[PDB]
């Protein structure tokens, strides 16, 4: 009767019901069993992916023993799992440990009784461990495990198991590499489907069967460092902390709206004897701003009850299903003894899933990521945990699911008015991506951009992070004129091993791992070295780039942007000069004639496989004066954001528009110094006028030209 | 064009 | 003769079979494009929309997507980047029921009908 | 330095052949001589990290306990296929009522194989 | 990815770092994968971009 | 295998890693197997593959 408290008990746990019911894995179990019974050494070791189950397979073995699904030579035995703390911490004195080493191993060799040994991590035996604290690399069991005397079952991971080979190359032929396979996602559906009984009895909340498949397949294409059973099981336990917090008690949304009552109304008391400057303008705002806040308050509590009224309907009508079935479950199913409720009340109960539950299906598209009173598990609530866990910033493309995505064309049209056909292809790509549609191994959003130097080639690009992600952090500027060298290829993919910078991973490979959902620039491609273009032909083609780790990087849901100049050599004699009329007869056909000749340059510099790689090539028209009316006016909207501290509100009449344009604009420079022409005459002298006390706090500067060639100091209240 | 029933 | 310049003629020796692919005839593309809708079903097998395309729909695609010189990559682009765009849009609002036998056809009108039948 | 050399695998056929009684008498199942020569040729062509007199023995060691699973227990297929009958019927017992319109095909997957699996049996 | 081997400097990717350098837990790029999966279909995507010295490894 | 000696810093597979660096166990890779079997035929698959630093070893 060994104590076994030195390790830990293992068989009685299934006797205690803690491990009853494990999805078996029959190709794996017999590899353990057929290792055990031979004449020679009897040492299986589980070697495989860290993300796969290691311990749970051996926990399956104990359940196979108690039910008798074992051969006669393996009946009755008990596994012993080992508490690794009790080796070194049990050494209170030197002479008091190794008697336990005699207590174990004399029960290992000639005991001939119930004996099965388990090791959590063999690294805690051979990689760690003092010679005086227990078994190390220099202790016994090396010439013992030739013989089939002692039967242990280990568990290690592959790349760390390679340390045992390079350590002394002697355990290599004493232990046994049993390769543990990844569990092949469609089987993990069958694993989690067997686990429907346990989680629904763990915490009660009903789990839909759409999302169970969606918990696994969405875990594939997005999460890489974890693997198939860890991804499939943690998310449902991470489905707890989203649902258990919100469905118990009041949800978080109502708590968020209660914060704005006391935080915002606190500032009314803070200005009583404060007759100083502008800050009393908030009284024109804060009363109206509270009318903006408190209307959101009144709707949420009314909608919360209606959703709670669905809880009052669903939770009672599901109780009626026990009446309608159990009477029929015992020989009335062979006799159909009521032809009354088996057709009437059952179908109408299904009609409540066709009426009350479809409203909750209809509840999702405006409650995309949260849930006020929802006991189901929708797929967007599963993918929100991906947004919660992976490198996702706050409110963005995916946070406005399936309804704001159509409105994203409007906001992007508020940046560059001109060049619809470019943005139309940009409009569809987000609709391909964030709407649960086809995400291929092609990265979503690959577009070539061509135009003269000056037009909004990278304007488009900044706003795709400023307005879409609302974060300005998914932008990755890549100066391709810094890659003019032939050696500069290694700056992306990393350096070859043993050489300078192998501790680095590559400059652009590293930034994508930190932000796996981002927008990627390539700024000045016409100067870039021709062999760096050889790298990009597989980046647009496939997601994968192997690295110094040979790690796999995906570029799914990453918009890759390919701005380059390439046009000032062809836009040459100002062909599109004064395209203000935009030319239905000629201009249009010039855009056909130009763009095919730019594909010729894509055949000339690029070795034209990029045409096969890129989804869609866009060509920018140069700016027209009808464009320059509204486009220059947008800078004056953002002018008041930085200068509301200064509180000079510059008003621009239409007379002020053409004075800026007609002295500065050309189709060559693409209205780039026109905004500098704003900055070079009027904007330098605001710093001097702010020093002395003329236009300091409340002075409405009316800027106008009466064909008088001077800004006016006509000022109002 | 879409053709729905 | 190029594999002995670029590839150092032992590669001509060591490799067993040097296969050379033809450019794609149009007779293959009635099947190759048809294979991609079956692989498109695998990306809508969660959604249970069964997209069925006949040869009366394939002929409009080939005539306005295929050059031989690129080997039918942009035909692939033409499916995804054009006609697949408002399979995605019509699903956003309540216009695509998750069980419809979706069919594509042309009435020789230079105009497409996507046919929804339950 | 009295160097042990590897035992030159064509000679290890004689090594295994000397040990056949230590495997045949150990548990009961005969071992054909056709599998011996093939057990040597897998040690040459395929595995290279372990060395020569192990791999000729360690495959036959695995050939020992392989047939013990069959003969001193259930055979391969009957043990495997009966569980998939029980596992998929467990998964129906997890469902027992669903929504329609998606799982309709999944009812038409798991249930239809039970007639197929039992006719295989 | 055979587009990465444009360098002659990048040949030691495949067969591994020589000893006295960083890679020993990493024994090499294509070497360790074949030991982990000896039944495989080893791709070589774009040979026309790999450097002639990388081809000297493929000679054997 | 002459293919592994294309780069200049690949000589260290012949005489092992130099001392004081990461490695130095299995002190040579060539000249260990030569010491294991000093009656043997030593192949060199090609010669045009190697960097010129490797050939200074073969002169010795
Ligand atoms: N076949 C399986 N059936 C059910 N749950 C499983 C299965 N395999 C793994 N798990 C779950 O995996 C989690 C434990 O991680 P495992 O990978 O099993 O542990 P492991 O195999 O030892 O990997 P390491 O060594 O701990 S990194 C638990 O939540 C288990 O429920
Ligand atoms: N439609 C537009 N909306 C907003 N800004 C625009 C627009 N068109 C041009 N611009 C301005 O022009 C700039 C565009 O940036 P860039 O694309 O870098 O210009 P560029 O001179 O073509 O430089 P490149 O493209 O890197 S060679 C922005 O800073 C804008 O202020």
DSSP codes joined into one string, A484-541: -SSGGGHHHH-PPTTSTT-SS--HHHHHHHH-SS-EE----GGGS-TTTHHHHHHHTT
Q: Which residues contact E31 (CB under 8 A, 6 or more apart)?
A: E14, E15, E16
> Which of C8, C10, C14 is closest, CB to CB, to E52?
C8
Q: Give the gap in angstroms from C-alpha C66 to the nearest C-alpha of chain E.
A: 24
E contact test, residue of F1, F2, F5, F6 with most E CBs within 10 A: F6
State the Cα–Cα distance between residues A371 and A384, nearest whole angstrom: 11
Return the residue whose CA atom lies nearest to atom 7 of ligand 2: A456
- Pull the structure tokens for residue F33: 């197997």
Burial of F50 (0-12, 13-18, 19+ CB in 10 A): buried
Substitution candidate for ligand 2 out of A459, A526, A619, A637 with most atoms within 8 A of CB:
A459
Give every CB contact of residue A632 below 8 A, 6+ residues apart in sequence: A657, A660, A661, A671, A674, A675, A678
Q: What beta strand segments (E) does A437-496 contain?
A: 447-450, 475-476
Q: Does an H or E element contain A701, and which? A: strand A700-703
Contacts of A302 (CB under 8 A, 6+ apart): none
Q: How far apart are CA A571 and CA A621, in angstroms?
A: 10
Cβ–Cβ gap C84/A616 under 8 Å: no
DSSP E32: H
Q: Which residue of D has its CA nearest to C46?
A: D102
Q: How far is B3 from chain C (nearest CA, A)?
A: 5
| Spatial CB neighbours of A493, under 8 Å, sequence gap ≥ 6 | A506, A509, A535, A545, A546, A547, E1, E4
Q: By C-alpha distance, which of A159, A90, A78, A163 is closest to A118?
A: A78
CA distance C98 to chain B (A): 13
- B2 CA: distance to closest CA in chain C (Å): 5
Q: Which residues contact A579 (CB under 8 A, 6 or more apart)?
A: A587, A621, A622, A624
- The answer to whether C12 and C3 are in contact (CB under 8 A) is yes
H/E stretch holding A289 reads helix A282-317
Q: How was this structure determined?
A: cryo-EM
Q: Which residues of A touch D51 (CB under 8 A)?
A: 173
Residue A543, Cβ neighbours under 10 Å: how many? 19
Number of helices and strands in chain A (H, E): 29, 14
CA angle A546, A549, A550 (to 5 degrees): 30
Classify A671 as helix, strand or coil: coil
Tokens of C74: 């942009």
Of A414, A423, A667, A672, the one to substitute when testing ligand 2's pocket (max ligand atoms within 8 A of C-beta) is A672
Contact residues, chain A, for D15 at CB < 8 Å: none
CA separation for the pair A498, A462 (Å, rounded): 38
**A651-652/A616-619 β-pairing:** unpaired
Contacts of A103 (CB under 8 A, 6+ apart): A2
Residues 6+ apart with CB under 8 A from E43: none
Touching F: which chains, 3+ CB pairs < 8 A?
A: E
**How buried is A126 (Cβ within 10 angstroms: 0-12 exposed, 13-18 middle, 19+ buried)?**
buried
Q: Does residue A535 contact residue E2 with C-beta atoms inside 8 Å?
A: no
- Report the residue of E17, E26, E38, E45 to disrupt the A interface, i.e. the one with the largest count of A CBs within 10 Å: E26
Contacts of A176 (CB under 8 A, 6+ apart): A35, A43, A44, A45
Closest-lying ligand 2 atom to the alpha carbon of residue A671: 9
Nearest to A382 by CA among A537, A174, A575, A242: A242
Q: Helix, strand, or coil here: A447?
A: strand
DSSP-assigned letter for residue D78: H
Task: Count other C-beta atoms under 10 Å from residue F54's C-beta.
Answer: 21
Long-range contacts of A408-414 (CB under 8 A, 24+ apart): A408/A468, A411/A467, A412/A460, A412/A463, A412/A464, A412/A467, A412/A468, A414/A467, A414/A634
- Site to substitute for ligand 1 among A32, A52, A55, most atoms within 8 A of C-beta: A55
Question: CA nearest E56 in C: which residue?
Answer: C8
Distance CA A537, CA D41 (A): 45
Work out the angle at residue C81's Cα, subtended by the Cα atoms of residues C75 and C84, and round it to the nearest 5 degrees.
100
Q: Which residues line ligand 2 (CB under 6 A)?
A: A 415-416, 418, 453-459, 523, 563, 565, 631, 672, 675
A191 Cβ below 6 A of ligand 1: yes
CA distance A703 to A681: 13
Chain A interface test: which of C39, C88, C94, C99 (most A C-beta within 10 Å): C88
Name which residue sits closest to atom 30 of ligand 1, judged by CA: A56
CA distance A531 to chain C (A): 17
Instruction: Tell me the angle at which helices C85-92 and A420-433 cross, rounded to the nearest 10 degrees.
Output: 60
Which residues lie below 8 Å from residue D109, measured CB to CB, with a gap of 6+?
none
Give Dmax (Cα) for chain D.
78
Query: What is the distance in A from the centroid of ligand 1 to the CA of A224?
Result: 17
Whether the Cβ atoms of residue E48 and residue C11 lie closer than 8 Å to each other: no
SS3 per-residue string spanning C46-108 = CCCCEEEECHHHHHHHHHCCCCCCCCCHHHHHHHHHHHCHHHHHHHHCCCCCCCCEEEEEECC
The answer to whether the beta carbons of residues E1 and A546 sit under 8 Å apart is yes
If you measure CA to CA, which chain C residue comes closest to A404?
A: C92
Cβ-defined contact of C84 to A432 (cutoff 8 Å): yes
Taking CB atoms and an 8 Å cutoff, what residues of chain A touch C81?
A: 425, 428, 615-616
User: Which residues have C-beta within 8 Å of that of residue C20, sequence separation ≥ 6?
Assistant: none
Three-state DSSP class for residue A315: helix
CB contact under 8 A, C40 and A438: yes
Q: Report CB contact under 8 Å: A496, E9.
A: yes
Please tell me which residue of chain C has the smallest CA distance to E54: C7
Measure the CA–CA gap between A242 and A382, rounded to whole angstroms: 9
Residue numbers preceding breaks in chain F (C to N > 2.5 A): none
Cβ(A474)–Cβ(A465) below 8 Å: yes
């Amino acid at each position: 009767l060994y104590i076994e408290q030195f390790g830990s008990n293992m068989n009685e746990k299934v006797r205690n019901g803690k491990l009853q019911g494990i999805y078996g894995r029959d190709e794996e179990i017999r590899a353990i069993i057929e290792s055990l019974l031979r004449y020679n050494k009897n040492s299986p070791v589980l070697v495989g992916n860290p993300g796969t189950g290691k311990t749970t397979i051996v926990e399956g073995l104990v359940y196979r023993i108690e039910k008798g699904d074992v051969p006669k030579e393996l009946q009755g035995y008990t596994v012993i799992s080992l508490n690794f703390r009790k080796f070194t911490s049990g050494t209170s004195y030197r002479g008091e440990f190794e008697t336990r080493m005699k207590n174990i191993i004399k029960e290992l060799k000639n005991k001939k009784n119930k004996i099965i040994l388990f090791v959590d991590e063999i690294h805690l035996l051979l990689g760690a461990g003092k010679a005086e604290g227990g078994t190390d690399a220099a202790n016994l069991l090396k010439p013992v495990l030739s013989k089939g005397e002692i039967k242990l079952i280990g568990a290690t991971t592959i790349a760390e198991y390679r340390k045992f080979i390079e350590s002394c190359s002697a355990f290599e032929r004493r232990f046994e590499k049993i390769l543990v396979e990844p569990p092949s996602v469609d089987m993990t559906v069958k694993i989690l489907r067997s686990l429907k009984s346990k989680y629904e009895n763990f915490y009660g909340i009903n789990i839909t069967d759409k999302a169970l498949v969606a918990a696994a397949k969405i875990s594939d294409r997005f999460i890489k460092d974890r693997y198939l059973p860890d991804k499939a099981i943690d998310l449902l336990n991470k489905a707890c902390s989203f649902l258990q917090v919100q469905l118990s008690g009041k949800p978080r949304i109502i708590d968020v709206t209660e914060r704005d009552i006391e935080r915002l109304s606190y500032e009314i008391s803070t200005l009583e004897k404060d007759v100083d400057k502008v800050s009393k303008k908030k009284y024109n705002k804060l009363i109206k701003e509270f009318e903006e806040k408190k209307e959101q308050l009144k709707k949420y509590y009314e909608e919360y009850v209606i959703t709670g009224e669905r809880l009052k309907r669903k939770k009672e009508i599901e109780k009626k299903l026990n009446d309608l079935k159990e009477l029929t479950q015992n020989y009335v199913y062979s006799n159909k003894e009521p032809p009354i409720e088996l057709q009437n009340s059952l179908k109408e109960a299904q009609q409540k899933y066709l009426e009350l539950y479809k409203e909750t299906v209809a509840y999702v598209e405006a409650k995309t990521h949260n849930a006020m009173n929802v006991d189901a598990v929708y797929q967007e609530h599963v993918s929100y945990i991906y947004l919660r866990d992976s490198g996702m910033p706050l409110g963005s493309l995916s946070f406005e699911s399936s309804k704001g995505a159509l409105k994203l064309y409007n906001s992007l049209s508020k940046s560059i008015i001109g060049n619809e056909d470019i943005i139309k292809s940009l409009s569809d790509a987000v609709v391909k991506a964030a709407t649960g549609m086809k995400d291929p191994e092609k990265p979503i959003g690959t577009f070539l951009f061509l135009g003269p130097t000056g037009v909004g080639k990278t304007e488009l690009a900044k706003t795709l992070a400023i307005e879409l992600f609302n974060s300005k952090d998914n932008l990755i500027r890549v100066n391709m004129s810094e890659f003019t060298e032939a050696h500069s290829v290694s700056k992306i993919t990393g350096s070859p091993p043993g050489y300078v910078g192998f501790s680095d991973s590559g400059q652009l490979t590293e930034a994508v791992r930190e932000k796996p959902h981002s927008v990627v620039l390539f700024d000045e491609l016409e100067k870039a070295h021709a062999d760096v273009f050889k790298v990009l032909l597989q980046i647009l083609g496939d997601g994968y780039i192997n690295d110094n780790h040979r790690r796999n990087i995906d570029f799914s849901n990453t918009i890759i942007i390919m701005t380059s100049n390439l046009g000032a050599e062809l836009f040459k004699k100002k062909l599109f000069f004064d395209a203000d009329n935009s030319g239905t007869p000629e201009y249009k056909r010039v855009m056909e004639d130009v763009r095919l000749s730019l594909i010729k340059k894509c055949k000339k510099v690029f070795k034209p496989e990029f045409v096969n790689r890129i989804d869609k090539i866009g060509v920018f028209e140069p700016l027209n004066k009808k464009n320059l009316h509204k486009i220059v006016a947008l800078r004056f909207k953002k002018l008041e954001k930085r200068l509301e501290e200064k509180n000079i509100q510059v008003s621009v009449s239409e007379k002020a528009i053409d004075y800026i344009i007609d002295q500065s604009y050309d189709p060559e420079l693409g209205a780039r110094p026109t905004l500098i022409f704003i900055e070079s005459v009027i904007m330098t002298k605001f710093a001097i006028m702010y020093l002395k006390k003329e236009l300091v706090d409340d002075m409405d500067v009316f800027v106008d030209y009466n064909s008088k060639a001077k800004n006016l100091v006509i000022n109002l209240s | 064009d879409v053709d729905s029933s």
